[PDB]
Coordinates of C-alpha atoms (C1' of nucleotides) and ligand atoms in Angstrom, one line a residue:
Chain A
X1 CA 0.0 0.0 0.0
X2 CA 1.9 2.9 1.3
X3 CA 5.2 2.3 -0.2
X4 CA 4.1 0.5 -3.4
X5 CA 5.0 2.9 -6.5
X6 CA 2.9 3.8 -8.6
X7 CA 4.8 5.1 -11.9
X8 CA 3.3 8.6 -11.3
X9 CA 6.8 9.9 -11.2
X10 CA 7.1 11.8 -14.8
X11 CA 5.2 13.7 -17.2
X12 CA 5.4 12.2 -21.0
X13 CA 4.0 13.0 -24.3
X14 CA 4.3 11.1 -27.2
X15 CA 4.0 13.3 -30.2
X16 CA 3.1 11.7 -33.4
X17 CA 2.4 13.9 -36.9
X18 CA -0.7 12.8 -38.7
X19 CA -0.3 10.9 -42.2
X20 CA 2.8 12.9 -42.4
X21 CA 4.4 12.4 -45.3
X22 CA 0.8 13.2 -46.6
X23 CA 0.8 16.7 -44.9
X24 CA 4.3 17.5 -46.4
X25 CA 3.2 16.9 -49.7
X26 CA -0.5 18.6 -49.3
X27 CA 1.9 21.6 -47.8
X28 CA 3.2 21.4 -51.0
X29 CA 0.4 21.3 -53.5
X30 CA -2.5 22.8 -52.3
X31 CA -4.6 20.5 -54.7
X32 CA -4.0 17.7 -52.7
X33 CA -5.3 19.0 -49.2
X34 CA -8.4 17.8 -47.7
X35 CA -8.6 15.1 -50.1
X36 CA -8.0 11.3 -50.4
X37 CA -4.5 11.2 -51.0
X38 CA -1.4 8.7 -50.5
X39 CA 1.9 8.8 -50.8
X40 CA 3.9 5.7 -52.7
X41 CA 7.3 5.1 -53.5
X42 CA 8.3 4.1 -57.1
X43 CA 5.2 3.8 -59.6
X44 CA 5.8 1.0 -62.3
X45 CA 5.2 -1.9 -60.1
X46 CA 1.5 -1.6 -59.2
X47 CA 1.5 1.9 -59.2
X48 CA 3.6 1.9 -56.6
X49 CA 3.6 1.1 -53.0
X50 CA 1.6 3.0 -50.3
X51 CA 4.0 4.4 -47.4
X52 CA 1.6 7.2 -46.2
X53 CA -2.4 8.1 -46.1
X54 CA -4.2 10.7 -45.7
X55 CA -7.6 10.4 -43.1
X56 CA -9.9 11.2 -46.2
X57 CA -8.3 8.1 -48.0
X58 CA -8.5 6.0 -45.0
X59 CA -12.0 6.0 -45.0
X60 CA -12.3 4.2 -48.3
X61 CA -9.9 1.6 -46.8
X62 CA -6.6 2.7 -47.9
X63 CA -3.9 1.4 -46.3
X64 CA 0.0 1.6 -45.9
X65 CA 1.7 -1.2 -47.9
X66 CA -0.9 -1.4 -50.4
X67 CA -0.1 -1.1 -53.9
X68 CA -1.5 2.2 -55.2
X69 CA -3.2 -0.4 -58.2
X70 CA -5.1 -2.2 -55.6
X71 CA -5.7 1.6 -53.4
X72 CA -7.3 3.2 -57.0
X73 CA -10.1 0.3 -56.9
X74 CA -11.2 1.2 -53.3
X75 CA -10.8 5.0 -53.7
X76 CA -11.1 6.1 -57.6
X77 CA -10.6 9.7 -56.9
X78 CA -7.2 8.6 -54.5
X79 CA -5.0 11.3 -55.3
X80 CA -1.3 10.1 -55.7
X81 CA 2.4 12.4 -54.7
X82 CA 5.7 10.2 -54.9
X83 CA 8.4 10.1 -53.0
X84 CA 11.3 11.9 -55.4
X85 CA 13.9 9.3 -57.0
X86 CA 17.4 9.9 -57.2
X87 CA 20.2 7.8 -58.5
X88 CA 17.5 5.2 -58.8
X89 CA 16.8 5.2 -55.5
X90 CA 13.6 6.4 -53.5
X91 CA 15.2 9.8 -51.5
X92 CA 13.3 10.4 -48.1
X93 CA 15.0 14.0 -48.1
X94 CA 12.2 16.1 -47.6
X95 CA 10.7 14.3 -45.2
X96 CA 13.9 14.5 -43.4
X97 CA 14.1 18.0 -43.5
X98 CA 10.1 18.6 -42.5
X99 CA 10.6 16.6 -39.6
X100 CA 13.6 18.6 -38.3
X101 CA 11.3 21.5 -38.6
X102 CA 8.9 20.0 -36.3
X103 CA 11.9 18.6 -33.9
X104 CA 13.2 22.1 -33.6
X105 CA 9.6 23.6 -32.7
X106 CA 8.9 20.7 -30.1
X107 CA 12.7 21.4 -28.8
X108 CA 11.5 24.5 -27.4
X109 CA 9.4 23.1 -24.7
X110 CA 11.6 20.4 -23.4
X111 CA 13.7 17.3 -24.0
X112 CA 12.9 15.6 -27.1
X113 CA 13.6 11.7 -28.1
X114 CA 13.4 11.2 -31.9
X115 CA 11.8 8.2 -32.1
X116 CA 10.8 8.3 -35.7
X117 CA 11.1 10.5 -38.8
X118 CA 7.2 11.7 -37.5
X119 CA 7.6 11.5 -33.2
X120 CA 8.8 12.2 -30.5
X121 CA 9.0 11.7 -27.0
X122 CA 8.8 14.6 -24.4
X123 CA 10.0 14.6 -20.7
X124 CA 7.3 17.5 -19.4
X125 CA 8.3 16.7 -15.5
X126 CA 10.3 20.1 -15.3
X127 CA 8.0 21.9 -17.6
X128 CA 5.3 21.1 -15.3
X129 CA 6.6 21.9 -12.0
X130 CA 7.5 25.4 -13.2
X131 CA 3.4 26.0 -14.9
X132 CA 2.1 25.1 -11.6
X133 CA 3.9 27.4 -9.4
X134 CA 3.4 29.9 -12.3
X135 CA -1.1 29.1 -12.2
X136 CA -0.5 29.4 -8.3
X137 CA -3.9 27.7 -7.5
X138 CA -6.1 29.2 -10.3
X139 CA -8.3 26.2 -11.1
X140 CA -7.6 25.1 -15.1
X141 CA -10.3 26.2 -17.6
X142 CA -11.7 23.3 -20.0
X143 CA -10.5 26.5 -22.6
X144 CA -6.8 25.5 -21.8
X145 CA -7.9 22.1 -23.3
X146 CA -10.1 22.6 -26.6
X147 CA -8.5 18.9 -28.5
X148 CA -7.9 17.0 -25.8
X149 CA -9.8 13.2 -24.7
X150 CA -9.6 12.0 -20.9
X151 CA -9.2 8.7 -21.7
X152 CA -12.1 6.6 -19.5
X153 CA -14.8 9.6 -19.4
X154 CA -17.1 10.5 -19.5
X155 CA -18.5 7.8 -16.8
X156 CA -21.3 7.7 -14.4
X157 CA -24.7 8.6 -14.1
X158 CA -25.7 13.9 -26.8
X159 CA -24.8 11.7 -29.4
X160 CA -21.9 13.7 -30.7
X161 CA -18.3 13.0 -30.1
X162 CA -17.1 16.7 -29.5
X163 CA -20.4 16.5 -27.3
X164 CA -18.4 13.6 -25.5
X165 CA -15.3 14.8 -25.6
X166 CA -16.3 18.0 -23.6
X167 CA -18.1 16.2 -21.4
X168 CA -15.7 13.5 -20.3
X169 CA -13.2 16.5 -19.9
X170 CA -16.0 18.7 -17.4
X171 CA -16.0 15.6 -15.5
X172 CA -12.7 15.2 -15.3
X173 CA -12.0 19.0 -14.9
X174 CA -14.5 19.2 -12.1
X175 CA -13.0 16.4 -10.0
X176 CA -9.4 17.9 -9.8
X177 CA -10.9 21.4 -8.9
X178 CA -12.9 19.9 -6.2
X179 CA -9.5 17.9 -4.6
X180 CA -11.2 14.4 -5.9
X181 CA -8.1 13.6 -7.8
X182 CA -4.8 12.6 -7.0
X183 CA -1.3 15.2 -7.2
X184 CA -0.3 13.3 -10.2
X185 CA -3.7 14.1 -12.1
X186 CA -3.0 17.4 -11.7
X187 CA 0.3 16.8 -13.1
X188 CA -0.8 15.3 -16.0
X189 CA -3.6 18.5 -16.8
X190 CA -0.8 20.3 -17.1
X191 CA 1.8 18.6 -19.3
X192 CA -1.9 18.6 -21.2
X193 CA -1.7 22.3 -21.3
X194 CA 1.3 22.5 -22.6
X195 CA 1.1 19.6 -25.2
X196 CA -2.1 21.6 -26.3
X197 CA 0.7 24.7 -26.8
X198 CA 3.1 22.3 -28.4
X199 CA 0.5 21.2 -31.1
X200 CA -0.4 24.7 -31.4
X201 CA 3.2 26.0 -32.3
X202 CA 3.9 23.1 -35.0
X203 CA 0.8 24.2 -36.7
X204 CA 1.1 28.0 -36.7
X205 CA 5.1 27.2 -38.0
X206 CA 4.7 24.2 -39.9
X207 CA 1.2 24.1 -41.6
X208 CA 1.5 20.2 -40.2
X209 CA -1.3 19.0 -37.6
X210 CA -0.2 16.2 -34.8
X211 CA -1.9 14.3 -32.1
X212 CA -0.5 13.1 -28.9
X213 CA -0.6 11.3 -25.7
X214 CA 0.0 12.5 -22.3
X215 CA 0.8 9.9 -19.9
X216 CA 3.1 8.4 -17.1
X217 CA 5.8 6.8 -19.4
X218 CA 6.4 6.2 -23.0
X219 CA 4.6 3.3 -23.5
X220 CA 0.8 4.9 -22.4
X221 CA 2.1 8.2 -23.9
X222 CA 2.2 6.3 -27.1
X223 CA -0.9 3.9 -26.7
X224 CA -2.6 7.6 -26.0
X225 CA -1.4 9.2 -28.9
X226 CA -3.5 6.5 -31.4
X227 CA -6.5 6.6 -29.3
X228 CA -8.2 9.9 -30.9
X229 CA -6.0 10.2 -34.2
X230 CA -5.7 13.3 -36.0
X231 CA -5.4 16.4 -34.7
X232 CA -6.2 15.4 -31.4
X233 CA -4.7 14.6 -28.0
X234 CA -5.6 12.4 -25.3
X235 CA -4.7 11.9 -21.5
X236 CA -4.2 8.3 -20.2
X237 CA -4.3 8.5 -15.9
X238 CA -2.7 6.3 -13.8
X239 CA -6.5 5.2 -12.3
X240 CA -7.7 4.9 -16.1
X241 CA -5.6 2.0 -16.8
X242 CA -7.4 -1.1 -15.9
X243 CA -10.0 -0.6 -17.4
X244 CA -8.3 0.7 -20.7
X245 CA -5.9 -2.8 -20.4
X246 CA -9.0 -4.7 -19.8
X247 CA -9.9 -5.5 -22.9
X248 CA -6.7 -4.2 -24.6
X249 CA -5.2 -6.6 -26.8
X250 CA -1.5 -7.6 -26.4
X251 CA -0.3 -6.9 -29.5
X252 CA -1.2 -3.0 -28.9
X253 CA 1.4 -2.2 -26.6
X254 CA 4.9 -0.9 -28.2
X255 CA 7.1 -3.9 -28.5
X256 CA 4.4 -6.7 -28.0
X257 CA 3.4 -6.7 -31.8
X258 CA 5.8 -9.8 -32.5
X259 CA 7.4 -12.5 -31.3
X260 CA 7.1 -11.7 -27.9
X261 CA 3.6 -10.9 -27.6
X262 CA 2.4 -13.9 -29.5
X263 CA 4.4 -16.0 -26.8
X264 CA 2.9 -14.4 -23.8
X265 CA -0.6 -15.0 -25.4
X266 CA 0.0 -18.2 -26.3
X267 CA 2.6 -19.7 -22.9
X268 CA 0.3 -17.7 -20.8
X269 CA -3.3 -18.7 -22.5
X270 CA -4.6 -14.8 -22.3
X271 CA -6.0 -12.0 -24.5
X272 CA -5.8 -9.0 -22.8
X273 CA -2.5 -6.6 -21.3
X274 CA -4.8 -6.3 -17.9
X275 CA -4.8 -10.5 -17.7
X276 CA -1.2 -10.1 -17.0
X277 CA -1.2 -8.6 -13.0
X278 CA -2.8 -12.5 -12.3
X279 CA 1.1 -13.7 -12.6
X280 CA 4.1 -13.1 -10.1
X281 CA 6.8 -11.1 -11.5
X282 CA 9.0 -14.6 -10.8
X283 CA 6.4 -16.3 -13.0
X284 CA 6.5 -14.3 -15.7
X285 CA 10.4 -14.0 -15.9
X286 CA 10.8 -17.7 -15.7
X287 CA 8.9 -17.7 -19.4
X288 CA 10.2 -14.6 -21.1
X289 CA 13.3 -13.7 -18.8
X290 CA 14.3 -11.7 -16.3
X291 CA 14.5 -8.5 -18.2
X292 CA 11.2 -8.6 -19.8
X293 CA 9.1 -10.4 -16.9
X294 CA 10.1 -7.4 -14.8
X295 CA 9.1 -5.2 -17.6
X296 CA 5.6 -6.9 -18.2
X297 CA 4.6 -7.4 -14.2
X298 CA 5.6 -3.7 -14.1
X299 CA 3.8 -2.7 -17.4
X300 CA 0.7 -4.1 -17.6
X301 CA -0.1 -2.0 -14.4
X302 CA 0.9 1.2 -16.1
X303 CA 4.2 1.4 -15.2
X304 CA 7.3 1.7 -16.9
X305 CA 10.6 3.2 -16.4
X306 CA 12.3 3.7 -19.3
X307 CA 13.6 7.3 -19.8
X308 CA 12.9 9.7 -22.5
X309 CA 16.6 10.0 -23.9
X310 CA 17.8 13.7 -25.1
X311 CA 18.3 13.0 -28.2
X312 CA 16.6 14.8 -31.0
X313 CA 19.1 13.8 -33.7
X314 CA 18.9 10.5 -35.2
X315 CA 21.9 7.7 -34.3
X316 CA 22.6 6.6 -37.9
X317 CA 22.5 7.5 -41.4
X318 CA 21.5 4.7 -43.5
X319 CA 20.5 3.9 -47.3
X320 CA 19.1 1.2 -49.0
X321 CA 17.5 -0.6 -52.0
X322 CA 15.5 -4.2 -52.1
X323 CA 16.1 -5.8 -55.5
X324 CA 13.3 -8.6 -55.1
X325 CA 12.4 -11.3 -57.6
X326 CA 13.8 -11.0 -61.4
X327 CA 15.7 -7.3 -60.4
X328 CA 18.0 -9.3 -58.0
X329 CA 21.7 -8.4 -58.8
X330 CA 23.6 -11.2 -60.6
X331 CA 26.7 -9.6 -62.2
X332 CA 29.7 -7.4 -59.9
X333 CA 29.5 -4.6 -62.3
X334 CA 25.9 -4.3 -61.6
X335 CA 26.8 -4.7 -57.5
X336 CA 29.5 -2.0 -57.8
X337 CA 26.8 0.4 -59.9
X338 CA 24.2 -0.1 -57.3
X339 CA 27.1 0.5 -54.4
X340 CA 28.2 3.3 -56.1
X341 CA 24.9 5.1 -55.9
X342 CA 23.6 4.2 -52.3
X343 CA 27.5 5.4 -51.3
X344 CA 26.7 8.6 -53.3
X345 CA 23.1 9.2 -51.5
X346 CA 25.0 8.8 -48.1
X347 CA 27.9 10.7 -48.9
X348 CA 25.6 13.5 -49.8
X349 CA 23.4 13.4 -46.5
X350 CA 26.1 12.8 -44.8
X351 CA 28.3 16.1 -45.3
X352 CA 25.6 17.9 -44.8
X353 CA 25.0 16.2 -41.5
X354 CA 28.5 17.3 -40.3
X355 CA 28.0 21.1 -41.2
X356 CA 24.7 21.2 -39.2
X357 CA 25.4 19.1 -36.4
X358 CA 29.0 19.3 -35.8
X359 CA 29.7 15.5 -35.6
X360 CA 31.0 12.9 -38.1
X361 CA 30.5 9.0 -38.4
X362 CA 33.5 6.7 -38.2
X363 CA 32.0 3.5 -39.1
X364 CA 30.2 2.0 -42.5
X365 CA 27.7 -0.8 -42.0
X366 CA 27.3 -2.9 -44.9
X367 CA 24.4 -5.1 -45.0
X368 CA 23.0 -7.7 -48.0
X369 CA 20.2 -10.0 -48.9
X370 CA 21.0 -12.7 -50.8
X371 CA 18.1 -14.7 -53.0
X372 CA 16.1 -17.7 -51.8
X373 CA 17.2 -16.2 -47.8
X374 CA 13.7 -14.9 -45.8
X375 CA 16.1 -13.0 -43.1
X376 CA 15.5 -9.4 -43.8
X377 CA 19.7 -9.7 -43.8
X378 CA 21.8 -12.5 -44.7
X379 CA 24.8 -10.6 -43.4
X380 CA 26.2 -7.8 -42.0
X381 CA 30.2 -6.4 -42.3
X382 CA 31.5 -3.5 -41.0
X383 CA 34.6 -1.2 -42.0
X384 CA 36.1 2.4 -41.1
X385 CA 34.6 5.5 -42.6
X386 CA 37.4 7.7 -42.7
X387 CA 36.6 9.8 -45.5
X388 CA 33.2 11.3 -47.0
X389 CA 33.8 9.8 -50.1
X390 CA 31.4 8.0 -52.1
X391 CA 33.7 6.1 -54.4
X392 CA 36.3 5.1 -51.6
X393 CA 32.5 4.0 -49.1
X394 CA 31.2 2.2 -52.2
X395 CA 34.9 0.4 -52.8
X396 CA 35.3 -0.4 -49.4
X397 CA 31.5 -2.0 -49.1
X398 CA 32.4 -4.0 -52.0
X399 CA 36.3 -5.1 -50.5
X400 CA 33.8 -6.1 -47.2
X401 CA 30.9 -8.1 -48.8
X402 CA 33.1 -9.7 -51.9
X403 CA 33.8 -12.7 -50.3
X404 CA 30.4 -13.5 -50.5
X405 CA 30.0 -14.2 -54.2
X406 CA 30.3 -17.8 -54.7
X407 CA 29.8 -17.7 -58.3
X408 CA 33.1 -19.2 -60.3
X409 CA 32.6 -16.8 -62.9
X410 CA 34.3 -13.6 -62.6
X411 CA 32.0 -11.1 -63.7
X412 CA 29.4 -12.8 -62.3
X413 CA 27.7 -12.8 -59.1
X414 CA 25.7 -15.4 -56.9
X415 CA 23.6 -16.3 -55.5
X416 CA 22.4 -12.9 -56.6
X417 CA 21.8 -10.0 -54.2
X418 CA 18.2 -9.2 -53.1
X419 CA 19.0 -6.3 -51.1
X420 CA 21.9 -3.8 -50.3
X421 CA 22.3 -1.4 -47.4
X422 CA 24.8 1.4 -46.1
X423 CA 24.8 2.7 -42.5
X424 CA 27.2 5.4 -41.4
X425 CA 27.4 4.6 -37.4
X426 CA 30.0 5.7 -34.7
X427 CA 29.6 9.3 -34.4
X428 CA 31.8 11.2 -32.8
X429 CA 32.1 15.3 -32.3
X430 CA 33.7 17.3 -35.0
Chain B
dC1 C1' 9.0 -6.0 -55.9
dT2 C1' 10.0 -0.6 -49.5
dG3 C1' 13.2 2.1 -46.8
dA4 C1' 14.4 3.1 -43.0
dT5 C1' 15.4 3.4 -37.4
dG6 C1' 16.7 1.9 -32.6
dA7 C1' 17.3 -2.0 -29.2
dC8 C1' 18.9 -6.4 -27.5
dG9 C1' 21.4 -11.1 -27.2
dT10 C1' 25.5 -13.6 -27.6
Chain C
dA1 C1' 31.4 -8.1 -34.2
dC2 C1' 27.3 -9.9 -36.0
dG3 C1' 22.7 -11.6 -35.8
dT4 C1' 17.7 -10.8 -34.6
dC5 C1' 13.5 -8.3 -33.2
dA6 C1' 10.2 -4.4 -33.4
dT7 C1' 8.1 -0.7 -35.6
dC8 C1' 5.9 1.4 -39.6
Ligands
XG4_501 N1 10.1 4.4 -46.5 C1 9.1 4.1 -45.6 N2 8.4 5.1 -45.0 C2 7.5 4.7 -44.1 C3 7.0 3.4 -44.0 N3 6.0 3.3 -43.1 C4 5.8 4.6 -42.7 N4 6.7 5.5 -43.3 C5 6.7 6.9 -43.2 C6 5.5 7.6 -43.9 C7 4.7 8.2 -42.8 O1 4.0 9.2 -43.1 C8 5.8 8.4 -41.7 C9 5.3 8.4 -40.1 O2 4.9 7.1 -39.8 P1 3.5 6.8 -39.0 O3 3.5 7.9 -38.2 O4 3.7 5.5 -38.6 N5 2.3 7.1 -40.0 P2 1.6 8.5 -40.5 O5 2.2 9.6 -39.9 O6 1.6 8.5 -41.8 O7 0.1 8.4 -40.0 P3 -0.5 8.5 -38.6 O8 -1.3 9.7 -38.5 O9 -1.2 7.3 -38.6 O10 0.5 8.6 -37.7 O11 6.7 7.5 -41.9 C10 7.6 2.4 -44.8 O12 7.3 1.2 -44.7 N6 8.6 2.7 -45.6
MG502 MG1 2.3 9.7 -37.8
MG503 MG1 4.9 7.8 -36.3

DNA sequence: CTGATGACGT
DNA sequence: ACGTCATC
């Protein structure tokens, strides 16, 4: 009772832009907003396939991964931008550089972990802290909160969902002014507040709307942040969260979408995150090990510990190209070619990654697929990156992966290469 | 026929 | 160092 923690310690949003490589191209070409709209990569095969959709599309059943072929029979009007190609290759570039506009902006408030090209996490403890000494007991208007959902409410004893929406919010509002809520809650308003501020600011600066989650930890930050998807935000209590893991599938927790969370369901013989509390800590370790036991007995009561790192720049530069089926790669000089031009790409997003961020990377990852292998990679080699240069990067990823060519011929190459990928790694200050 | 990231185990 | 998982 008394000394049992609670995981009410921290403040956390989960910022997440909606359909966002949709929005950066509706920025762009004003024809395309407030329409059914994707965005695909490539456009022969299929028409392409689907990476991004826009809310309006989604309706008609438009997915991500679809091919745009199979998306124009469900949606005929589906509007269509593609990512730009370079050197044969799809280049995520602008995307890139749209979502360092909206890191910047959300850098403002607080820390910031880039956990995406599209999110972040936000440590809003601090931020907090200073608001409420700052509101010095004035109760918080339901004005402060105009998009976001108390997760749980409205409860108790219109048909509209703004209609519910403000009204799970009064309820929710009038229990913390009347002291019926906990220190934490109160907590939680705020980093609301300000997440309503945040949202605000990338929209005014950006043009790009965002939903979020305000929560505890990450993990119900992010569970949140998809509850009232787009443009809205939604607050997930400590006290809401049996009932929200109740009926919660497994699979809909962050990192319980695989392996993992198909073995708890099926060792353990349950449905539900909430099913979990029914097993000692003990129990659960001795089936999925010590590490993640302790993390599931402590999550699926709302807890979780896991800091938001201050990081707002991503870890790696990376670039790569499947060649599936037919395409595969079966000669060197078409391996070298294709080499040539990921090294190019990085070398490129590289250098400019030194002159912003005053750092360069030290290490080359060099990762294949080779045909008739299901693992996403049939092998990794590394080597050192001690020059931004694409030809020498592209030599020194063919010196590293040669050796794998069994092929007698020469100028020939097999079994022939499904996949290639270049990773810078290793950074260091500059 | 996708192109990325970040984390973890050994 | 290298392989695998998770996410999307
Ligand atoms: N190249 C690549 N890009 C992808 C892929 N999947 C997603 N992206 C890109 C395209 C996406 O726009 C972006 C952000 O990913 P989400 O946030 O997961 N989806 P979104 O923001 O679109 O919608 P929502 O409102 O539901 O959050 O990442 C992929 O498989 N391949
Ligand atoms: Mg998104
Ligand atoms: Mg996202």
């Amino acid at each position: 009772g008394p000394h049992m923690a609670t995981g009410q310690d921290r403040v956390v949003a989960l910022v997440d832009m909606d359909c966002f490589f949709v929005q950066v191209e509706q920025r762009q070409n004003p024809h395309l907003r407030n329409k059914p709209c994707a965005v695909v990569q490539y456009k022969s095969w299929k028409g392409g396939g689907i990476i991004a959709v826009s809310y309006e599309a989604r309706a008609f059943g438009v997915t991500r991964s679809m091919w745009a072929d199979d998306a124009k029979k469900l949606c005929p009007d589906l509007l269509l931008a593609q990512v730009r190609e370079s050197r044969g290759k799809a280049n995520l570039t602008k995307y890139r550089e749209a979502s360092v506009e909206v890191m910047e902006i959300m850098s403002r408030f607080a820390v910031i972990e880039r956990a995406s090209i599209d999110e972040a996490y936000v440590d809003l403890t601090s931020a907090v802290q200073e608001r409420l000494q700052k509101l010095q007991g004035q109760p918080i208007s339901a004005d402060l909160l105009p998009s976001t959902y108390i997760e749980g409410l409205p409860q108790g004893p219109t048909v509209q969902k703004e209609g519910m929406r403000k009204q799970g919010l009064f309820q929710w509002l009038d229990s913390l002014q009347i002291d019926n809520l906990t220190s934490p809650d109160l907590q939680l308003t705020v980093g609301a507040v300000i997440v309503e501020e945040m949202r605000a600011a990338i929209e005014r600066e950006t043009g790009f709307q965002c939903s979020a989650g305000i929560s505890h930890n990450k993990v119900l930050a992010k569970l949140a942040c998809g509850l009232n998807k787009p443009n809205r935000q939604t607050l997930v209590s400590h006290g809401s969260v049996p009932q929200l893991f109740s009926q919660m599938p497994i699979r809909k927790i962050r990192s319980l979408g695989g392996k993992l969370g198909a073995s708890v369901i099926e060792i353990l013989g349950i449905e539900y995150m909430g099913e979990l509390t029914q097993f000692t800590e003990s129990q659960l370790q001795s089936h999925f090990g010590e590490k993640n036991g302790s993390w599931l007995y402590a999550m699926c009561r709302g807890i979780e510990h896991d800091p938001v790192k201050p990081r707002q720049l991503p870890k790696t530069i990376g670039c790569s190209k499947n060649f599936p089926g037919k395409t595969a790669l079966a000669t060197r000089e078409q391996v070298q070619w294709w080499l040539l031009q990921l090294a190019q790409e990085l070398e490129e997003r590289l250098t400019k990654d030194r002159n912003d961020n005053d750092r360069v990377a030290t290490q080359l990852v060099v990762s294949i697929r080779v045909q008739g292998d299901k693992r996403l990679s049939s092998l990794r080699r590394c080597c050192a990156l001690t020059r931004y240069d694409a030809h020498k990067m592209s030599h020194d990823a063919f010196t590293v992966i040669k050796n794998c060519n069994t092929s007698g011929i020469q100028t020939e190459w097999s079994p022939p290469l499904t996949m290639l990928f270049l990773c810078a790694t290793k950074f260091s200050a500059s």
